[PDB]
Amino acid sequence: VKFDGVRPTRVEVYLDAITHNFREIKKIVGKNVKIMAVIKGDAYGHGASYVAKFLEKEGVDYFGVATTEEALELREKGIKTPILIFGYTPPTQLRQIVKHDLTQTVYDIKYAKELEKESLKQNKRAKVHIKIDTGLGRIGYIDFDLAQKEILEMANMRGLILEGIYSHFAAASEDDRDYCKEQFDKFMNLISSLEKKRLKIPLKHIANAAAILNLNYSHLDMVRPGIILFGAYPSKRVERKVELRETLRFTTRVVHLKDVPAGFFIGYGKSFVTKRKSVIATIPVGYADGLDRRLSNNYKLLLKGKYVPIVGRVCMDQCMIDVTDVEGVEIGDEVVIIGTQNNETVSVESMADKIETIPQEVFSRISRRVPRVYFYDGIKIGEVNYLK
Template sequence: MNEKLRPAWVEISRKKAIHNFLEVKRAVGPNVKVCAVVKADSYGMGSVELSKMYLENGVDMLAVAVFSEAMELRKEIKDKDILVLGYTPEEFYDDAIENNITLTVYTLELAEKLNAVAKKFNKTAKIHIKVETGMNRLGFLPTEENADKVAKIAALGNIFIEGIYSHQARADEKDKTIAHKQAGKFISFIKMLEERGVTIPVKHIANSATIIDLPEYHFDMVRPGIILSGFYPSDEVNKDEYKFEICVTLKAKLANVKTIESGEGVGYGHLFNTTGKTVVGTIPMGYADGYSRLLSNKGY
């Protein structure tokens, strides 16, 4: 926001943002693609601006959560693959095909409907298959029956399965038992598909934590998210091998400064209480800016 209109703003360090992206590239090596996850406006940092930085430094694909985010990116970024990780309503299939947006498919019925729309435009719709391995949200369960369904999708005339992926639920924990279990299910399903003659070029399961701790699951592509901002996924991942730098700073001008006496409470619930004369500064931002009340007395 223009500082003249509002005395609170976010600053992004271009140098640190690029460093974080290049650190991901270093982690995965030259033979693994990088799909930068820029959902939620890159966690409020500006997806278009950051995506352009990543493009300048060799990103292979961009990923967002919902279709509207993909369309916003497409207005500014014309020639790079954009993957929608979440649900896309059928009424947007026309726009997806016309704008070369890659959709996630997790049922045969969705694929058949998308194929029909693509056929109408005499085009091929590019998709990624989502596999359910443990998050228990979207995705094909890794069963023989569902392998048959994906084989049917692969046979559709106006569909190209470019990728297949899953998402790790607990890779950021020190105990990697669940992470290994999920990866095992993913690999097993890929083998089922290959037995049916279905070979999918881009396989990916690695989120930020998996990129850092589980290089054996980098496969063909990785999907960094929070580490691009410079934050580690948790305190349980290895912080020694790769150094990510926080690239975002929230700033505001002081609206008022005053001195209050000992024994005074500050803010809702008086969660902070003075033990002596204290200088208190007030800044002009709050809930409307995404600064949660849950952070009361926890900022620094």
């Protein structure tokens, strides 16, 4: 329909497409290789609640998130699946991760002790994964000699469970195979040293989407697909042997149509002027919704399967488009910003290229003001308006 209870400007999340892309990852990896769905940044702007709910039905082995509150949000909504927090959970918030049984990242002994203390205080055991810095220079142990010592102590701390150990590739998306091979070996060399001290950590993992496609050796015990679950690739230097489906459609509606003559100025600073008789539509989406202002006078959106350019500057809440070439335009016609419309697509990757970034940042730009509508087998099954 033209309009409904939900805001005109919206994100349509296709849950059956996410579960499909998830099933594509299982084909690439072995039958005994576990999958951790990275759904950080609110499932890359898709809404963690619903995405986690539907991946839990699909039988996912783990979830990956960036923060404590991301991990807790999932538990608040009845997610039973194990969850791993990549980031630092401050000492002041340690009670919560122990209470709701959340896996925590650890790469120093003082922090492990503080966690153990809270684990013993609640008479539960805090699952932990050890992060190793094999080249990325971000987080994890860099002194491998120190790492062995502290990791071996943690193995003897009864308040903890030393379930996992992991690292992260620095240039897998850039396809520096020599560095990926180099990072992998360092990682395995630390594990060999630990296994020689009678310590078998059940979950060794290192591969993100880039290495999952290319580096069959990096699979290990568990694999960490993120953006790839949402119908996009991390870069152009990947094999793309999987068949991805479109998971998100960022859409809005025609809210106003005017006929104007030539020499008619549009937008702030009179940055655009018509060179002909034109039909201008206004659409209630702007930069506060996640439509980058740099697309002012250099992007085309989809309307009835035709490309329509943004004319004038992108405002905070709205922008104008030239619809002169499109016949039969009406109030409440759908306008697609990201995604497919009638044998035509303005993909998330195309948008990322135009503003010199990657699909992950584009998805994360879609703001709180944009409600998420959810679909499964073609039918709408729920919605979230964050303004509520």
